[PDB]
Amino acid sequence: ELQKLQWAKQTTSICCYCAVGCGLIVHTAKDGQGRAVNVEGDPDHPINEGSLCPKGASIFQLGENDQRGTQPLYRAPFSDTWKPVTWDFALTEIAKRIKKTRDASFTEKNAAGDLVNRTEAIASFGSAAMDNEECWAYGNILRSLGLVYIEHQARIXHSPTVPALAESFGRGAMTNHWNDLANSDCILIMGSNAAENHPIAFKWVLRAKDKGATLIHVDPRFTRTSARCDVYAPIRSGADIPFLGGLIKYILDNKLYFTDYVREYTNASLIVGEKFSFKDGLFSGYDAANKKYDKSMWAFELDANGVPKRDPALKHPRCVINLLKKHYERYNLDKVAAITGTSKEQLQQVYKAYAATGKPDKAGTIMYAMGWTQHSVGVQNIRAMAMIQLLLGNIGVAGGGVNALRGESNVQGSTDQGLLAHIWPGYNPVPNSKAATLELYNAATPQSKDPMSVNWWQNRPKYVASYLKALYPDEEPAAAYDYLPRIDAGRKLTDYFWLNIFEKMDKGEFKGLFAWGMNPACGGANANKNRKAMGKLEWLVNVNLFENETSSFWKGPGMNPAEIGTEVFFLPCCVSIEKEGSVANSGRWMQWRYRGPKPYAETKPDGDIMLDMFKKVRELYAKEGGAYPAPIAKLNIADWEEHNEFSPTKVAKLMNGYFLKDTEVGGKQFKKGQQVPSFAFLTADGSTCSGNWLHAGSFTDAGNLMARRDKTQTPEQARIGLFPNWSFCWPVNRRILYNRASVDKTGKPWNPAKAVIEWKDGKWVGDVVDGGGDPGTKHPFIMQTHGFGALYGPGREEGPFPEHYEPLECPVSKNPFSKQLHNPVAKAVCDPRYPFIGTTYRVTEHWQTGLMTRRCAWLVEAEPQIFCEISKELAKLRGIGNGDTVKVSSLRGALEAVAIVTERIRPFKIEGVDVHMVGLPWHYGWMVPKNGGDTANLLTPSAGDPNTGIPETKAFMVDVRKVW
Amino acid sequence: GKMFFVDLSRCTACRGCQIACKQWKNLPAEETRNTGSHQNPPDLSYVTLKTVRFTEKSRKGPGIDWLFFPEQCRHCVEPPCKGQADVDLEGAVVKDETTGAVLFTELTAKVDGESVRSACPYDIPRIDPVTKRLSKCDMCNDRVQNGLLPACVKTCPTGTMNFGDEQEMLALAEKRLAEVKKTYPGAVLGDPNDVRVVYLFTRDPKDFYEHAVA
Ligand SMILES: Nc1nc2c(c(=O)[nH]1)N[C@H]1C(S)=C(S)[C@@H](COP(=O)(O)OP(=O)(O)OC[C@H]3O[C@@H](n4cnc5c(=O)[nH]c(N)nc54)[C@H](O)[C@@H]3O)O[C@H]1N2
Ligand SMILES: Nc1nc2c(c(=O)[nH]1)N[C@H]1C(S)=C(S)[C@@H](COP(=O)(O)OP(=O)(O)OC[C@H]3O[C@@H](n4cnc5c(=O)[nH]c(N)nc54)[C@H](O)[C@@H]3O)O[C@H]1N2
Ligand code: SF4
Ligand code: SF4
Ligand code: SF4
Ligand code: SF4
Ligand SMILES: [S]
Ligand SMILES: [W+6]
């Protein structure tokens, strides 16, 4: 026996940091009745096999931490100090602030006379850190209160992926999963530092290399990832589209595309209309006055039945594939080398290695994360990756995919639960003011007349109705539709997003902010602006593990508490290992985890904090009345509670959904109260509820499939690592999306040695087939209107093909590909006092703003202070020695950091001039530790663009000077 | 006995191993500062039994050779530390007969600590300034005797860390060296007949650390 673990109860959990979703084992003293005594890896978990990076490996120190919040704290207007208060006081007073602000600000109808039933006087930030059941409950609480300004982390790092990949494949999700990386023949890591930011992914990346894969890192910097790749190719900041356009040209010129896959499964054969053109860097339908395209000019030519015309011979000059060849003919090696700064020799090496995966029995994967995809053409960067993968036949196959790596443990789930201003749960859009009825809302879904096109989104009315029945079970969906707030049809959608919430706050336009599991005083771009702007709030609610730069902004650097009127409530929540629930990882694996120790001190799980808060608001409305009470009074919260507490199990069952009456669906009889077995059995007529149609199948009459810990695999499942009996992934346990594209028209795998699905004895064996139907009878992309992987993507604001528009404004004056320098549908000052390109990025040992990891002594031990990474060339220019203190400054702010002088950074050659990059970690803040430094977001701008609503944190102008 | 095979050609310098060693033993954190390096703590100490050493080497063309070295006691087959300590008092340094772990006891306070560090060919032992006890990696010998992997081996994401019976680990080291030479032609094993922690280096071991090999 090990004394340390004797007498302790062992439970399982899932890491609370990144989206890999590593398994933990937690030992809790006194057979579960005391504190955690140990936290380490779960040896049985199929993703990590017991491995943990330093963040997972230190979760014991995060949880058993005497700096954690212990009880609610209250800061009165103009006060110098916190006062400790009861949960009863804090939640009672917060409910009064919510009700006072809502009653004063609630709008039934907008200026135009359209029903909107909303309050614009309260905003919410957060959070991908909450469990899936908590995220789902939180969004429904905020929407029942009438909020529209509902945002979180996903806006920055997830939001560009969803439309890029949805345009290309029909869904926004990461297409494959972590274990599947070991099946790749060539791994291209580009806009990702996965060895530092998804460290257990390198278990599977290095296993691919063991079986003969080539590993390629394309990054402006040499990182811990680069050290373990076969090829490191430097790229200039923002030169990704030229790099990827050059690879498209290389694939087409050298005939390395997967011909049969391209003909059958992509839109290569579709005939584009005569109104499509591209000239001088502009597509047809450009409106120069409004800086916008008439996308109707990009329509397909339709047959007599309304279906896009196809030429399967691919000879018609207006075939997608022929327009594609013409578009990318400009991306020659000489021009691509000049702009990327990558040598022609290295471009040829990378292109040859990667394009070799166009062979049917080879697979290539692309791994990207946040990288620099935040700028106005980040969607087109991701489109280009999707197009390359479709040309090479890498979508739907083992070791293939677009592995768009999610950031946080539950950013997949928090997005799935609609914690962004434009979406309800399950990616049903938030209604705008012109969607006056449920019938009009449903009318917007595009239809297909192609009998081979599944067009699965035609089922949307079932999902919206079942969602409204989960919230308001005693109302007809058409009546409950009027309870939920609507955004203005006449406003830019970005007016409701992250950056404009900070801008409105700075204009004094919010009374209240929820900072729920986020640190916006460090995570928001232009921290000096945002910290000042928080002083313009009447009230702030911060729900968090520790006191932090947001909770305590009023006593931050340069702040006089006696001049700051903001009322602040600090509500301490419990850590992941102190509560039960699920988190959805980057591969869509929805994993159940259990309580080890009880909540520390008087901390509470988020579900209890939000439900108690909402019950107090509801009580106030029952006693006082006020603005439109129906959405609050009628919300179904009885299904969220058991034994006087928030119930993760009951909320997960509601999110799956259940029958409200005896129902015949899909030729099967279901009884009142039965769990819905899959979203295929939801109805639009009120017979079913489901909080999230993507969850229908996760928690059935068979039990909690998210809690399965079964390693059982068939030989074909085990060969590629599907682990279909370990947890559950949406949709309906399809581990590899688009897997009908992995077989020929008879159901035979392109790569039998790595089969995903195979037609055997009248059924699909292996993975769950992504779309039912006999081989050769359906188009493989079932969430696409037309059924095909889109090379040509005419729903994108910037055009149907990616095109280089320069994202680096200050040092670049010339575009070698066209007369159009900058994005024609998209204010940088470029003050010559700030000649260097500042960038922010992560290190393995710290998490996000560092609020969590700056409280962990072993992680501070390894990375104690903010640093500034510079080249030998810049160090020589500015007289900076390794380890010197430097001042980094911008138009927005200034900070001190320790210089790290390294050959891992080299100058960029731009138009015959060396341009220097300055690297900073954004993991530091004034609260802790001693001499740690403050946020790199003191330096960053807050401009964004009218299309993304995302600030520039990867290329912003700075100066660096030695401090003596 | 037992053996570690440490394939440095797979290391991402994640420092999972550095943290896992301290979590298992509940060791304190040192006071550290950044002096122009990711490396920290800068050295082994009484409270740090493992630290990842970082070395940058220039190469022709893009990037660098970035060398990572998770340093620990080699658990020598014939340990000079024990031969030195035994001059002053037997029992201060002992060897587990089944695993081969070399173990410092509380009796290290009663010997010439500085002399024991000096006897070590790898410069491993560290002295507590207050109590004069010596510390170093103990092979997680209690975990090993209970059928568990050492904390640093279990945590490692990359397959850098490997542990088992000496026969299976020497066979693994031989097989892996032949494969790694296809990528790193100058790869060598560190003192493989003398120690129980056998590092595979991708080049001259002294490029990783002055005391990488004897
Ligand atoms: N250790 C750790 N892991 C994390 C996090 C953390 O804080 N710490 N955060 C998590 C979260 S929330 C997220 S969103 C993810 C983000 O994960 P990543 O996107 O991997 O994060 P970064 O390190 O910010 O950026 C990745 C790389 O992009 C490179 N890059 C910069 N500009 C360009 C460019 O123009 N082109 C290309 N091709 N590359 C460029 C940078 O040099 C950097 O190495 O990480 C997650 N994982
Ligand atoms: N300059 C710059 N800025 C950036 C980025 C960048 O690359 N550069 N990255 C952006 C991105 S991608 C992201 S993801 C954001 C992240 O920005 P934030 O989310 O604001 O960062 P943190 O607050 O550090 O994230 C961890 C938080 O999780 C909370 N937490 C942990 N467990 C729980 C729990 O159970 N409940 C609750 N309620 N809270 C919990 C902690 O208290 C802490 O506040 O920063 C963005 N900002
Ligand atoms: S931070 Fe990510 S890679 Fe590290 S232990 Fe946690 S889930 Fe695994
Ligand atoms: S074997 Fe145990 S004591 Fe030695 S370095 Fe690894 S974790 Fe630390
Ligand atoms: S490495 Fe040094 S301290 Fe460790 S066993 Fe050998 S002589 Fe003793
Ligand atoms: S845990 Fe493994 S990969 Fe990470 S630094 Fe240690 S030996 Fe290297
Ligand atoms: S995230
Ligand atoms: W993120």
Residue numbers in the entry:
A (entry chain AAA): 36 to 861, 869 to 1006
B (entry chain BBB): 2 to 215
Could you give the paper's own sentences about this structure?
The tungsten-containing FdhAB formate dehydrogenase from Desulfovibrio vulgaris Hildenborough is a good example displaying high activity, simple composition, and a notable structural and catalytic robustness. In these FDHs, the active site is well conserved with the metal being coordinated by four sulfur atoms from two molybdopterin guanosine dinucleotide (MGD) ligands, one labile sulfur and either a S from cysteine or a Se from selenocysteine. FdhAB has the great advantage of being tolerant to oxygen exposure in the oxidized state, allowing its purification and handling in air.
Crystals of the as-isolated enzyme were soaked with dithionite inside an anaerobic chamber, mimicking the conditions of the EPR titration. The model was refined to final crystallographic Rwork and Rfree values of 12.1 and 15.3%, respectively. On the other hand, in both the dithionite- and formate-reduced structures, the distal MGD-2, which is believed to modulate the redox behavior of the W, suffers a distortion in the ribose moiety, when compared with the as-isolated form. Furthermore, analogous to formate, dithionite reduction leads to a small movement of SeCys and its corresponding loop, with Cα-SeCys192 shifting up about 1 Å and the His193 side chain moving away from the metal and being replaced by a water molecule. Similar to the formate-reduced form, the catalytic metal site was refined with an occupancy of 1 and very reasonable B-factors (W = 14.9 Å2, S12/1101 = 15.0 Å2, S13/1101 = 15.6 Å2, S12/1102 = 15.1 Å2, S13/1102 = 15.1 Å2, Se = 18.9 Å2, and S = 17.5 Å2).
